[PDB]
Amino acid sequence: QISVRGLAGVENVTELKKNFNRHLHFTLVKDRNVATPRDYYFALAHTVRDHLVGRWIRTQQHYYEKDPKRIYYLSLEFYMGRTLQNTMVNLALENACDEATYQLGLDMEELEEIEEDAGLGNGGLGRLAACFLDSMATLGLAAYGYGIRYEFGIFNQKICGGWQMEEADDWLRYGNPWEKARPEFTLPVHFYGRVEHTSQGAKWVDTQVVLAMPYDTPVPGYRNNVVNTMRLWSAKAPNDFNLGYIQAVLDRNLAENISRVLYPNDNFFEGKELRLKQEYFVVAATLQDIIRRFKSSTNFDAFPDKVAIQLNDTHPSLAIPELMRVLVDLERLDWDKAWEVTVKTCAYTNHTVLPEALERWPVHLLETLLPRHLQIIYEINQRFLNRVAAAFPGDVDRLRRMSLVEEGAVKRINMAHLCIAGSHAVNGVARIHSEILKKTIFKDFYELEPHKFQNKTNGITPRRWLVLCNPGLAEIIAERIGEEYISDLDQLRKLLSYVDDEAFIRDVAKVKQENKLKFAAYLEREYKVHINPNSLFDVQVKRIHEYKRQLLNCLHVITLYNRIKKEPNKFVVPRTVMIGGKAAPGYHMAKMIIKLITAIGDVVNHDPVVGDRLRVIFLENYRVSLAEKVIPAADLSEQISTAGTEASGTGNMKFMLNGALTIGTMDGANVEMAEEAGEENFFIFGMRVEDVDRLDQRGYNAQEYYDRIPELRQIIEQLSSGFFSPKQPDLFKDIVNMLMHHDRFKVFADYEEYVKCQERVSALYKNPREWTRMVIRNIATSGKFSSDRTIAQYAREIWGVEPSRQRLPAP
Amino acid sequence: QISVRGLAGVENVTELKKNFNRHLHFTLVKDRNVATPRDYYFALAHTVRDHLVGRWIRTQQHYYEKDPKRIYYLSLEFYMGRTLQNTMVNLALENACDEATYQLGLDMEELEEIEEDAGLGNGGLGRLAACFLDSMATLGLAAYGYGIRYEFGIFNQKICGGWQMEEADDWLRYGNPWEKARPEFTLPVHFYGRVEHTSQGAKWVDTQVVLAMPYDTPVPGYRNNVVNTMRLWSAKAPNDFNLGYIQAVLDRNLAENISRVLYPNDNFFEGKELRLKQEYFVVAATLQDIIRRFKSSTNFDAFPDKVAIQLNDTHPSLAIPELMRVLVDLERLDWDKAWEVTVKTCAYTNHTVLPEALERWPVHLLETLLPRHLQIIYEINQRFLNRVAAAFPGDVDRLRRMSLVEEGAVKRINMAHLCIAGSHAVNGVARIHSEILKKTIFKDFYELEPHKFQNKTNGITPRRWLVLCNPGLAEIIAERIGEEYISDLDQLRKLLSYVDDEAFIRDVAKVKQENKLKFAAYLEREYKVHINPNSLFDVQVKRIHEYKRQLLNCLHVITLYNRIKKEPNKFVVPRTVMIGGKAAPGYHMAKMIIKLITAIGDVVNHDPVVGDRLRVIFLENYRVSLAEKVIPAADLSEQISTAGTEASGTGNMKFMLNGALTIGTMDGANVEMAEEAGEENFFIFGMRVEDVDRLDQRGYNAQEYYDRIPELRQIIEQLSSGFFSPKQPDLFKDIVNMLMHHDRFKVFADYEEYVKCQERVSALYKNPREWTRMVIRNIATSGKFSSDRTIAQYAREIWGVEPSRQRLPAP
Ligand SMILES: OC[C@H]1O[C@@H](NC(=S)N/N=C/c2cccc(Cl)c2)[C@H](O)[C@@H](O)[C@@H]1O
Ligand SMILES: OC[C@H]1O[C@@H](NC(=S)N/N=C/c2cccc(Cl)c2)[C@H](O)[C@@H](O)[C@@H]1O
Ligand SMILES: OC[C@H]1O[C@@H](NC(=S)N/N=C/c2cccc(Cl)c2)[C@H](O)[C@@H](O)[C@@H]1O
Ligand SMILES: OC[C@H]1O[C@@H](NC(=S)N/N=C/c2cccc(Cl)c2)[C@H](O)[C@@H](O)[C@@H]1O
The missing domain is CATH 3.40.50.2000 (Glycogen Phosphorylase B;)
Known part of the structure; x- marks a missing residue:
């Protein structure tokens, strides 16, 4: 019908129709007499998704052979919305599918309305991550989005008597055709326990274990045959968990609650233990996956040449002490080398200046949940404040203002301060915002290390x-x-x-x-x-x-x-x-x-x-x-x-x-x-x-x-x-x-x-x-x-990689 | 290789190989370089399962057109084991798949070992239900197995220091290729509440609602092209459930725990509330499904001509008062007609004589959980004991022995007595067992209604x-x-x-x-x-x-x-x-x-x-x-x-x-x-x-x-x-x-x-x-x-239907 929606060639339309009928039969176990509109949506979703497979396999194969620097975008939110139309657009299949469904006697727009939003975010920050993934694929970057697969996304809002009522967003009820479970890459995540000191360093022992099972979702670039991956982690209890018998099995829910629900606060901080567990869960699983992929390329000097980690706000800020933990405790690098690697690997994006939105975790929470990380944070703080003291001798108030540890009734860790100390780049998200960061809330840090501060206007x-x-x-x-x-x-x-x-x-x-x-x-x-x-x-x-x-x-x-x-x-x-x-x-x-x-x-x-x-x-x-x-x-x-x-x-x-x-x-x-x-x-x-x-x-x-x-x-x-x-x-x-x-x-x-x-x-x-x-x-x-402009600027000014508009070979 | 495993024709082998490769690519998103043995199992499972689809659709279509009497086998246990080899055997695909995989360089027996048992039972009773489903399909009966889809089946046993240790049987971890979710047939199940009396009868109000979502598994007959259905229910919270916000979402687990785990007692009764909820859950969802299917054929006189319900022990005994509840409260039939329909519809199989294995539910549990059912049970008991009194005038001890209500410290309902009163047939499972029932534990009932008692030796x-x-x-x-x-x-x-x-x-x-x-x-x-x-x-x-x-x-x-x-x-x-x-x-x-x-x-x-x-x-x-x-x-x-x-x-x-x-x-x-x-x-x-x-x-x-x-x-x-x-x-x-x-x-x-x-x-x-x-x-x-002999006897002597060895048309 309209030109930008691509071609509807007779061969393509015939093929789509065949495969649609195949899926209705073999995949959905329906015929046209009993099929509901939801069945028709699924048949179409499977038909379109089939077209991603070859491109997805060969994109990932390509990155393995060429070994480019990989970009890891860590976020607790990916506000994706619907996937069917976006996939058709990026693969130039829209007109062909429109024609194929029309000939089958169906209205494709009606079918599109059946898909649930993947509402894995609250608003602007989560939607930014989604636009970013699309742009990174379109610009041919070797990029991975890493997050949590929430069983329940942002609540559905109902208005009753003029009042908001909240309803659970049970988005996975009918099954999600846009994911592939990867249980073979399941990884252990550790919680609680205690720190033991041996002749050869610290050891974190007596921990409780939760499994992280990955689900992969394809991210297609615009007509360039690139398909990148968004990997989302789901929490699973180990099989010997709590193992009278009946209660032990029912109590598996306690471990699995980590990935159950998205926290519905935007621009407001609530210091709840479950949220902290979510933040560590995504960070621990992701870093293990990153390290595993890097070793499949001993010497971590080249780590920052092959890895960039982007922190979407402070929510995944535990990446900094977790990277240190792995490099120092597990890989046995000296502190100073581990720190150099960490700083060069990590970059931090700030999304707000409202004081009530800043993450300030009570020390007593970190002490119980992540005892080793608290020790590492204390050490980071001591060495950082030693640097401040040497640059600004006698300025004792600067020392208190800049500390990662905040004094008061309850001692807290300022996660934004941790992110600045542990990152080679810090950016705001519009020119005026980035200027406000330098003149106000992070003024002290800008004076110490002006080269770290950048602007990347959103798109x-x-x-x-x-x-x-x-x-x-x-x-x-x-x-x-x-x-x-x-x-x-x-x-x-x-x-x-x-x-x-x-x-x-x-x-x-x-x-x-x-x-x-x-x-x-x-x-x-x-x-x-x-x-x-x-x-x-x-x-x-x-x-x-x-x-x-x-x-x-x-x-x-x-x-x-x-x-x-x-x-x-x-x-x-x-x-x-x-x-x-x-x-x-x-x-x-x-x-x-x-x-x-x-x-x-x-x-x-x-x-x-x-x-x-x-x-x-x-x-x-x-x-x-x-x-x-x-x-x-x-x-x-x-x-x-x-x-x-x-x-x-x-x-x-x-x-x-x-x-x-x-x-x-x-x-x-x-x-x-x-x-x-x-x-x-x-x-x-x-x-x-x-x-x-x-x-x-x-x-x-x-x-x-x-x-x-x-x-x-x-x-x-x-x-x-x-x-x-x-x-x-x-x-x-x-x-x-x-x-x-x-x-x-x-x-x-x-x-x-x-x-x-x-x-x-x-x-x-x-x-x-x-x-x-x-x-x-x-x-x-x-x-x-x-966001193509935005991502090209991140790529060149922060990640140290060149975007590419070139096509990968098709079939 | 061996004759009974069927033919390996060149056309078949070529086709299986093609479809195996298609599934590895499109379904599993793998190629031969990264595929694990588990991937190969799944590719084979999908390839074989494809062969069931046409036969499954046309079997169910056939029952709709011919409208035979339908048999509903209600059980809390279906001990199915593995499905891949059984499916190949019944479809005569074993040699063809063996050859096809061999030519792909794979050992099929090695692939078979990857499949998890569907361990949805404890031992003999659960395995009997499974053999029965196979025989009912092989004998061309319009049969449905109805049960619960437990997230965790019978525990995996580990021996440590000579002691049994239990481990959760997380059988669904990798996904189950042998089921099709049917969320379109989700039904509400009611719990708690209270009974209100109106001018026109009782009403059950203020209930809590749990959803029952069905999953269908095919049951292929032996080379007769029949594919019957085993429908298993999964518990789902409604979306407005408990709807501070975070806890309300997490508390959905409370409703969903109903289908979480199989009780691991065989031949021992434990009066736990969760087990009672499981028993009602399967019964309520199943009866609604049965009634819906019957209406799609006003007058319930023909109900027993079109429906047989087999109770596998007393576990689904609540079918009796639930059927009465629906017929009296919802359909507005008079008591005596409802009762006639119920008796003619239901039959009961006893599987043990050990007193500690008999279900005797405390009245206070039924009062809180199922208040309307307790009232119906009391009424059933009154009318039954009135019959005993007329047959055996003055025999006051017979009245106490035969009562559905047991006196003592805690008042209990004897579920076996309920089953006998409400069924047209009662059978034991071997000749000596059936004789023991008539001479000992059910002697009083045999004297009252000798025609009800039968033997059906197991197979x-x-x-x-x-x-x-x-x-x-x-x-x-x-x-x-x-x-x-x-x-x-x-x-x-x-x-x-x-x-x-x-x-x-x-x-x-x-x-x-x-x-x-x-x-x-x-x-x-x-x-x-x-x-x-x-x-x-x-x-x-x-x-x-x-x-x-x-x-x-x-x-x-x-x-x-x-x-x-x-x-x-x-x-x-x-x-x-x-x-x-x-x-x-x-x-x-x-x-x-x-x-x-x-x-x-x-x-x-x-x-x-x-x-x-x-x-x-x-x-x-x-x-x-x-x-x-x-x-x-x-x-x-x-x-x-x-x-x-x-x-x-x-x-x-x-x-x-x-x-x-x-x-x-x-x-x-x-x-x-x-x-x-x-x-x-x-x-x-x-x-x-x-x-x-x-x-x-x-x-x-x-x-x-x-x-x-x-x-x-x-x-x-x-x-x-x-x-x-x-x-x-x-x-x-x-x-x-x-x-x-x-x-x-x-x-x-x-x-x-x-x-x-x-x-x-x-x-x-x-x-x-x-x-x-x-x-x-x-x-x-x-x-x-x-079990072909056993089922042919149930069919002729209890269900009133003729078995058929005839083939349905193939493709
Ligand atoms: O359809 C419901 C189920 O689908 C499964 N997907 C399978 S078997 N293949 N996917 C293949 C595929 C192929 C291309 C793109 C994508 Cl994105 C996926 C998921 O692993 C499971 O979590 C989900 O519940
Ligand atoms: O950069 C993208 C957008 O980011 C938005 N930030 C949001 S939604 N933050 N949520 C922060 C948040 C979310 C959850 C918890 C906590 Cl403790 C904080 C900005 O308000 C908006 O001006 C900007 O366009
Ligand atoms: O593979 C994992 C998922 O598979 C889904 N099955 C789908 S999409 N088609 N099946 C078609 C089919 C076709 C023939 C026989 C059978 Cl038995 C099934 C199930 O609904 C879901 O619960 C499960 O998690
Ligand atoms: O008819 C098939 C087989 O049935 C077996 N019964 C079993 S496993 N009952 N479980 C009863 C049970 C199971 C769970 C809870 C409760 Cl309260 C009772 C018989 O012991 C065996 O002789 C017979 O061959």
Whole structure:
């Protein structure tokens, strides 16, 4: 049907049909009379997966023969979403499968909807790991993702009476066709025990053993025949475990709980023993696998030439003392050589500056669980602080600030400090974020070792986030500039030549309208909600957090409602305001914010005077597959975090690529997006980081804003008095109290500028030609935000490897 | 190579080779350079399993179109063993696969050894269910086995310092190719709650819900293209289960524990809540599935014409009140009609007379777990006792004896009484056992309803237990009489014509020698033990129980050792005495018996004066795959239970079919075996049931035997003084004490007769021609003991259906 989806040759279509029927019969044990739509999905999944096998075997064979430097990306989160369409895209099978299924009397898009998301992450950090794997395969790097195979991923969100309810994400229930169990590579992981000192060094003894069983998932590059591996570990009890008899068998669950469930906190640290066990489990199993593969190439001098380990935040920070443990205790290297190898091998990426998100593990936990690692950490700290002392003699406060060991009621280990000491490179994830790291939280470390600090601005893969989710846009672009841009996104700059092209303008606007129509229909069908597709689609989707300021959005929504009620017969640009995102289960304020949003909808959506000029919808169960639907449909992207709080953002980049304009603060990657597009093509408002700092110095007084802004006062009085909760008049008192007395994120301080900026958005939307021309200018300058660019920079500046766009031989 | 293993045609071999290579590549993601022997097993398993698919689909399609009466065999145990060879045998693929793998450079027998036993049973009862499924498929019955898919089957037994250690049987670790998950047929099972009475009857409310997910395993008939289904249920928590957040997800294990592990007690009742939950789980899920299938054919009058439910012991006895519950509470039938339907649908098989093996559930357990079922049971009891009262007016003690409710400290429900009341047929499993049921434990019930009581003597499948495990014997038989005997075992009578045939005599003896050589080699390789293959192979393999009298065997072994030591230079027929079997983990005396056996071996096997004239070996981890190896190798089968205690035995039949002679008491099926073969062709000894009864009446005094038999006195003095445990002189005091003061099974009473009978065995073994002629007379009369005969009798006399030997069309 459309060109970028590849060829549908008669030989291919005939073959796909044959193999689909073979799988339905032999694999699924069904015939067409009893087969359910789920059976059809599986038959198609197996048919497509068959095409990966040869390429996967020969990619891995290739790395063995050429022995390149291998990259190991360690993460506790890989937010993969669905795999079927992505695989078809990367193998150029989409049109062929579409035709083959059509001839079998099936709708492929209907089959695609059956697949469960692999929701093995919370939000931005987990999704970044996924985009990164796609880019590493597309750039021909010998890369492996290593993580945990959670039995339960991020919970499914249900909204009941306007409140979030959590439901277990039992994603493996029907079996996962996109994994291959590798029980032959099962490895032991050790916990507890004690340290014994012998004539020849320390020994870690009397440990409990949990087995780590690997499951491999293929990661196909874009049409280059490369298939890399994501290896995820599952926890298994040994067979002699706890071995009255019945209870011993039932108690195997205690060991196996390690890989049971993903912790649902993003940007918040909870010091629970189970989480610590998860972090060590992935690290211990992975490092053994890395060392085994390296030996199959005695002398660890060449280890850093053949191995790079990337730590995705501090979650796998135990890699540093674990590598030391293996090199010193097991391989018998001297400390200084082991340390040199470790530093040159490891690099660390920081993803946040919020103090409550930093991992600070109580010493007593590490003492019981990982006694040898605590000893190694103490030694690392002593030698590091000896270096600080020599560089800054007499500066005793620097010594306390820089220590890996934090003093207080409970002694804690600062894992970020451990990562900096033990890594040759430390990076932030957007220019402003990386600068903040050097000037504030890690200032002391930057002064000691300035060469370690780098920036690597985040990106997204334009395979999933354009070709897959927005084929209509991909196609109209391809018609003008060809297909090369899909793996060289900078080519989108060529679209600047078409900004005055009447045909292109019409086509861009038409694709958006179609996307909005499709999404308005998705809403009615699956959620029985009725929206006006002619309205401006105003979208804020991301995890619910005070710093992300969904609350500021709420205030604007109520302002618009109040203005309409004040002057009902005045024209306003119609809007559909969509907010979605999950709240961490224990985060009370985030749960209240969801309830507020739905409560506002309850009032606004049923007011006869408003009509269809304003609708407020909460998008339930926001996840990767939902993002793929809503992002192409959006007109306005809300990126409104308080300046200095969103490290990068990546949702922002997705909207830019897909033809929405952005309203945002100068925070995270927004800064670089505005710089790429031109500030005149962006809706910037609000305090800069410097303004926030000024306000903090004299002190933030919310009352001042309340006193000076009558429209703001009205809203607060409506919230307090029970206008949005007539049955429970005091329901939102916690929210009002926080805003008035305890607001870390200065919601009121940006209110006036935000509302004014929103007026300017409405003005532009009244002029479809000019709206669309600004859109073209955004899409045309989105090239920098490809994760291909990001990964090429990691490769050259951190890992010491060259990317390659060259094809591997096919069959 | 050998004829009974089928044809190896060039087309077939070429095709098998192609598909084997396809599976290694696409299914296993391996090539020949990295493939392990386990990979090769799986490639072969998938290749063979592909051949089942068409036959399985069309068998089930056939039953849907013809709508025959369906047979549902409910069991908590299905002791299946390995599946690969059995499938090849039944599909006539053995020689073709042997050739195909040979040409690929592989040894198929080596690949077969990789498969794990499906050890979903304890011993005889579980293995009977397995033989039954094979026979039902071979006889073309529309039969389904229903059970539980235990994550852990019977434990693997390790012997450490002569003591049994238990290890978890993690049989699903590598994945099970012989199952297909059917999550689309998942059903809810209810627990706890309370009963509410409305204007229109009772309602069971406020229940907790566990999901039952079915897994289907094919059961192929012997070369008739029939493939029946064994459906096993797995426990799954609902997604909203317990739904701080982390703990709620981890607590899903509590629901899912229902299908985690097989209870390892055979012939012993333990009233644990988890076991009760297992029993209801299988019953509730199965009955829903049965009813659903029946409705897909309003009026339940025809239910018993279309449905038979066979209860394998009392373990699924809750089927009776569950059927009533559904018919009365959900379908709104009147009580009397529901009861008529229930009785006509259900039949019950009893497998033991030991009082400690009978299920007697405490009322307080049923009250909490299954409140509605307890009410139904009370009502069943009231109406039943009203019938007893009318038949036997004034007989108040009969009323107390026959009640389903037992009085005492704790009120209990007698499940066997429930089964008799609610079934149209009750059978024992050998003639003597069925007679004992009528004369003793169920005498009162037999007097009330004599028509309900039947006998169905047990059998074994001659596919697994001859063709599969003993191809050499199967072949020499086939050479004389053709192949028809494999599904018509009575044809073995034709071998009586060959009892004087010198060629046949030589061939029978040669096959035994080869089997013994192969087993003597298996022992050296896997267990580093050295046995003389010229010795008489004296074998007792079965679960360890006092009633089975492994202890009597021990006494004979020590007698032989003592006699040798007394007259070292006298000739004795050399013996290898092999004992094996698992002890239930909580059965202390059975654990001591294992320790005694190994302790005797420790003395006997290292005494230079004995040489190779006597060896005592404990066979570790006795299970189905081990039985397939040892049984063909045996010369003498030990079946030495106290008369009246072994309901049938089935191991006895296996040895008979495979060319061993039997030393045994007139107990269980031994009686019918001796009757078939002729008592002159059997080594019968010891008390009959009548003699045991006489002894009980005057009282059993072990001291009398000790006082009168000097050889027995010596043995007891050796045990007591520490001759067999020099470091722990008192180790066996518990055993001595039991024998002397508390022996329920009268070990001493049969000692003299046993020893004398063993002398007669040795005498015959000195004459190879006459030994072998008696063997031929045993094999020739083993036909009655085919489970094909057993199932044909169930079919005609209980289920009301005709067996069919006719082929279904192939492809
Ligand atoms: O279908 C359910 C089961 O599938 C199994 N996969 C098998 S047998 N082959 N895969 C082959 C294959 C081939 C190409 C790509 C990939 Cl990604 C896999 C998995 O090991 C198991 O964990 C899972 O439960
Ligand atoms: O770099 C990718 C993205 O990373 C996000 N960080 C996230 S989701 N961290 N989760 C941290 C976390 C997660 C679990 C536990 C703990 Cl203790 C911390 C940033 O907020 C976002 O600006 C950026 O675009
Ligand atoms: O290989 C491991 C997995 O295999 C799956 N089987 C699948 S996908 N097809 N089977 C087809 C089939 C075909 C013929 C006979 C039989 Cl018996 C099965 C099982 O559902 C799953 O529980 C198991 O873990
Ligand atoms: O009919 C087949 C065989 O059945 C055997 N019975 C066995 S293994 N019962 N287990 C009963 C059992 C098992 C678990 C729990 C409880 Cl509470 C009882 C008989 O002992 C044997 O003579 C006969 O040949």
